[PDB]
Design a protein around this ligand. Structure first.
Ligand SMILES: *[C@@H]1O[C@H](CO)[C@@H](O[C@@H]2O[C@H](CO)[C@@H](O[C@@H]3O[C@H](CO)[C@@H](O)[C@H](O)[C@@H]3O)[C@H](O)[C@H]2NC(C)=O)[C@H](O)[C@H]1NC(C)=O
Ligand SMILES: O=C(/C=C/c1ccc(OC(F)(F)F)cc1)N1C[C@@H]2CN(C(=O)c3ccc4[nH]nnc4c3)C[C@H]2C1
Ligand SMILES: [Ca+2]
Ligand SMILES: [Ca+2]
Ligand SMILES: [Zn+2]
Ligand SMILES: [Zn+2]
Length: 805
């Protein structure tokens, strides 16, 4: 019940919320159907429209007007945004040359530059260049302030997940808004765009910017706007709030436009109908900037122009139907569209089996436009598994396509030419970032970055301490003139042992053999130096990674590579090696095919054994430093050490061997040497975080050898590729992957073909940030470089997307 008989008199767009049954007058009262009776009349005036004209200048104040052109309007803070232009011979903000804002220029009583977030729905990244002719205001923001060529959204590239990621710095698996539509099995409740369940606070996790602000004593405008409130009124309300007394005035604000998303769904991302809504958005931006100018805040306020996701060409005819795949289609519930999520229709149905669903959805048609996944097999970069609201079964839909359950869902629900939601590395899904103001840099282009990073910056812009989030605080310091956050490297928790020769051959009973008894002060002194670390500066280029948890491990040195070997997991945590442009690939010689060698630096009790691989009919082994890249026939023996061995399914070895034999050398050729760090990942609970010892769900049969869920590699070289990777003076260039360690290649539909036709494609799908790997291993990389820490943080957040321009 709402007792709507109260009044909005002097409360229009009030900031504190009144709970039921008291009628409300805030910017969301319409969405709750709870506004006071006189809200429209008093708060939503439209008389005479939104622009001053010559004949209105100096008019007698008339309180019925939507905005004012009388002399008192400035003191009142309620002039039309073009008032001074029309009546006082002032210029529009867009017609002024831009002039660096070297220091904040704010009216007295402003404790800090205010932040205004101008969010635009479905604003595709390429609109900045392609629509630049009809967007003069936005183009000036872009060219004069700080801009990125694009900003990467989070998956799924839908509205609620991304707007709430913006606000919180969190992955949707953490903040809880994992789609526009959701079922939560613990609540037994559904979240929908349509209806009232979505206003329930239980859905919304983490701590969004407005709460972070309020709690730390910084007032916030309310971020959300009921749809029916026109854009002009949104803008006039922000402007009015900004003329409140110092004690009452908020320091952070949000505007939101439904455009250009709304039209992009109807007309496609580039439909000729799309010009108008881009023009209209620009006009709205111009209104705000003119309004700030009038208030003397245009060189005081930080403005963020930001979008939530892009828009792709999608039409009804490009739909795949689960009914052409499954016998049991009526036994499932599908969340449909640009992504698919599948659960049982009834929890009482015991003939439901994900295994059979997955298989009936796997590589069934030549042209198949979606790929099914158990959520834990989704690329780790998507960070989309650790929430009960995400269904075990997921369908990754090709750009341009939909998935539905049955044809009747599509014609009985073309009506549309655009949509979004696809994989967040897809070009058409990328979106915009522009920062403009005293705290942002001047005419500066920054590289593309992820929207999860903005919350930290918005907090920095407001002098707030961010709630714990998935951004890497400091990685966006290069966007900022001042207010930087100067982080320190985490402290190493475990220090390595450095074992020498401690065991005789006969002490080992591992069931391994190697043809190495084929036997000198010249080279023996030299090869002892190798074991002691004489080549370590070549292969360990950016210092040893730090171990950020409590564990027991050894550093092991070799001619061609260096490792940190876990006595707890019985295999390296990381293996590091450098491959120069000139390095040469060799084969594994015949007499060494099955060679595995005890490591006399490491006890039998802390070693793997070959017997367990003999007995485990499912499991084979690979090596982290590849024997194919040994610097000499003698050095090659090191690569067959039991301490370089890791468990690998035969199907995964097809992948790994092709990476080691062909691709590493290729990257070394193309990039002028590369430094490689490889190792295992254990994430059995799919939380994006390293598993402890008591969380391992699978061992090589009979043994305590744990089976990795993933293998990673970090491939670093010189950004200035005219310098070799091992003699690089300046910035670095990195690409990484986290490959799922799977017993089959079902994910790659072309895998019966030669590795050259499908392995690199898999690795690109599984591209990762160094940061992703850090979360999964508890290691901290790049600890000793000549680069500043913020630059290193930026590098650690970089993702190599292999998407074209
Ligand atoms: C992304 O950032 C968030 C925020 O730091 C990380 O989520 C947080 O992760 C930890 C460990 O899973 C959670 O700690 C747990 O808290 C509860 C008490 O609420 C307690 O029962 C547990 O014993 C544990 O201490 C924390 O709740 C969680 N917070 C949120 C807001 O989700 C997340 O791990 C980050 N993701 C990645 C991949 O780095
Ligand atoms: O008032 C807000 C958000 C303000 C805000 C500002 C800053 C925020 O955080 C930031 F400032 F940090 F960005 C967060 C929210 N909203 C967002 C809601 C989207 N919506 C749709 O009907 C809709 C739109 C596109 C679609 N495509 N497909 N289905 C779609 C459905 C209703 C809108 C009300
Ligand atoms: Ca884990
Ligand atoms: Ca296959
Ligand atoms: Zn959206
Ligand atoms: Zn949309």
């Amino acid at each position: 019940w709402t007792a709507t008989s109260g009044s909005c008199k002097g409360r229009c767009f009030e900031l504190q919320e009144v709970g039921p049954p008291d009628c409300r007058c805030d910017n969301l009262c319409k969405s709750y159907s709870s506004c006071c009776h006189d809200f429209d009349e008093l708060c939503l005036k439209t008389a005479r429209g939104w622009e001053c004209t010559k004949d209105r200048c100096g008019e007698v104040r008339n309180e019925e007007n939507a905005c004012h052109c009388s002399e008192d309007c400035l003191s009142r803070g309620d002039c039309c945004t073009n008032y001074q232009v029309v009546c006082k011979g002032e210029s529009h903000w867009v017609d002024d040359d831009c002039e660096e804002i070297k220091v904040p220029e704010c009216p007295a009583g402003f404790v800090r530059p205010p932040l205004i977030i101008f969010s635009v729905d479905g604003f595709r990244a390429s609109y900045m260049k392609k629509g630049s002719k009809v967007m003069p205001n936005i183009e000036k923001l872009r060219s004069c302030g700080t801009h990125a060529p694009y900003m990467r959204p989070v998956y799924p590239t839908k509205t609620f997940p991304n707007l709430y990621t913006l606000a919180t710095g969190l992955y949707p698996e953490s903040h809880g808004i994992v789609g526009n539509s959701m079922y939560d099995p613990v609540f037994d409740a559904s979240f929908h765009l349509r209806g009232r369940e979505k206003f329930n606070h239980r859905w919304w996790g983490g701590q969004p910017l407005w709460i972070t602000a309020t709690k730390q004593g910084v007032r916030a405008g309310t971020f959300f706007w009921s749809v029916s409130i026109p854009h002009e009124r949104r803008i006039l309300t922000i402007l009015q709030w900004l003329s409140l007394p110092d004690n009452e005035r908020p320091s952070v604000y949000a505007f939101y436009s439904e455009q250009p998303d709304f039209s992009g769904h109807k007309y496609g991302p580039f439909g000729p109908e799309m010009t108008n809504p881009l023009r209209e958005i620009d006009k709205t931006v111009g209104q705000l900037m003119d309004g700030l100018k009038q208030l003397r805040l245009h060189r005081c306020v930080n403005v963020i122009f930001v979008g939530d996701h892009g828009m792709e060409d999608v039409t009804c005819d490009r739909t795949e139907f689960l009914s052409n795949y499954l016998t049991n289609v009526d036994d499932i519930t599908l969340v449909p569209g640009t992504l698919g999520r599948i659960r049982a229709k009834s929890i009482n149905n015991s003939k439901y089996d994900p295994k059979t669903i997955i298989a009936a959805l796997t590589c069934k048609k030549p042209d198949q436009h979606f790929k099914p996944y158990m959520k834990q097999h989704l690329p780790k970069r998507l960070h989309y598994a650790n929430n009960r609201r995400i269904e075990d079964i997921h369908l990754l839909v090709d750009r341009r396509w939909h998935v539905a359950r049955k044809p009747l869902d599509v014609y009985k629900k073309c009506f549309f030419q655009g949509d979004h939601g696809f994989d967040n590395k897809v070009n058409s899904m990328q979106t915009v970032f522009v920062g403009y103001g005293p705290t942002f840099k001047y005419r500066t282009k920054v590289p593309p970055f992820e929207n999860i990073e903005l919350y930290n910056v918005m907090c920095d812009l407001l002098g707030l301490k961010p709630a714990p989030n998935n951004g890497t605080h400091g990685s966006l310091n290069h966007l900022l003139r001042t207010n930087t956050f100067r982080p320190t490297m985490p402290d190493e928790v475990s220090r390595p042992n450095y074992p020498g020769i401690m065991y005789l051959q006969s002490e080992f009973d591992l069931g391994c053999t190697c043809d190495d008894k084929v036997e000198n002060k010249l080279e023996e002194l030299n090869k002892r130096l190798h074991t002691k670390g004489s080549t370590k500066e070549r292969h360990l280029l950016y210092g040893r990674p730090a171990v950020l948890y409590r564990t027991s491990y050894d550093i092991l040195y070799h001619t061609d590579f260096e490792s940190g070997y876990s006595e707890i997991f019985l295999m390296p945590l990381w293996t590091s090696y450098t491959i120069s442009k000139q390095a040469e690939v060799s084969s594994i010689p015949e007499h060494l095919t099955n060679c595995v060698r005890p490591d006399v630096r490491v006890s039998p009790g802390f070693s793997q054994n070959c017997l367990a691989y003999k007995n485990d009919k499912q499991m084979s082994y690979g090596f982290l430093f590849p024997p194919y890249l040994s610097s000499s026939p003698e050095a090659k023996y090191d690569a067959f050490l039991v301490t370089n061995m890791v468990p690998m399914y035969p199907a995964f070895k097809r992948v790994w061997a092709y990476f080691q034999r062909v691709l590493v050398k290729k990257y070394a050729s193309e990039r002028n040497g590369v430094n490689v760090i490889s190792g295992p990942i254990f994430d059995y609970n799919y939380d994006g975080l390293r598993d402890t010892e008591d969380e391992i769900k699978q061992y090589v049969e009979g043994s305590s050898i744990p089976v990795p869920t993933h293998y990673y590699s970090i491939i670093t070289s010189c950004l200035d590729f005219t310098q070799p990777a091992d003699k690089c003076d300046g910035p670095l260039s990195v690409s990484s992957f986290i490959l799922p360690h799977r017993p089959d290649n079902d994910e790659s539909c072309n895998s019966s073909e030669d590795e050259s036709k499908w392995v690199e494609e898999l690795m690109k799908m599984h591209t990762a940030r160094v940061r992703d790997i850090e979360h999964l291993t508890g290691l901290d990389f790049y600890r000793k470089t000549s680069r500043s820490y913020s630059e290193i943080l930026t590098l650690k957040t970089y993702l190599h997307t292999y998407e074209s321009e």
